[PDB]
Amino acid sequence: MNIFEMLRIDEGLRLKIYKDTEGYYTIGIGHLLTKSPSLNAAKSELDKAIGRNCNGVITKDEAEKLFNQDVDAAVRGILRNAKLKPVYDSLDAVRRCALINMVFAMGETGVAGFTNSLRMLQQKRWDEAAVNLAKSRWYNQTPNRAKRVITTFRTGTWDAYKNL
């Protein structure tokens, strides 16, 4: 298992504009277009992100191009971030994927807000961090995916992804 397969599990793939859990205009593999209410705003973001008139629809190839960008931006973001970087450098490879998954889902800013959990992760306090992370709006809104991520952090194994 790798980060792309892991995110493909958690995000799904939709070749047409769709509304996210949160109510937002999203496309392909978890690619947020706009937080705004207009399906037209979303269709515009969409043509600009692709470079063609899409009319709400993309090909696999395109969704995967988008996804390559996203993951890439997620990892460079972490590495550039002063809170994030040191946590990342301190973790083993699987746990790294887990931080990357979160950052991808809720942006750098959101993640770095998890001040206490980040500190436990850095201290390698696995169980404690798992509990702290569960006490979030994120956990409450998308319990099954948040649980898979937390498990990934608690264990350092791909277990949570091995039934999917």
Q: Is 4 annotated as a binding residue?
A: no
- End-to-end, the C-alpha distance of the chain in Å comes to 11
Catalytic position from the list 5, 10, 11, 70: 11
CA distances to 38, 63, 66, 85, 102 from 57, in Å: 16, 10, 13, 36, 27
The reply to whether 136 sits in an annotated binding site is no
Alpha-carbon gap, residue 162 to 64, rounded angstroms: 23
> Has 132 been labeled as part of a binding site?
yes
Q: Which of 22, 11, 6, 7 has the alpha carbon at shortest distance from 140?
A: 22
Q: Residue 20 catalytic?
A: yes
Tell me if 46 is assigned to a ligand binding site: no
Active site residue 72: no
Binding residues: 32, 104, 117, 132
So which residues are the catalytic ones?
Answer: 11, 20
State the binding site for substrate. 32, 104, 117, 132
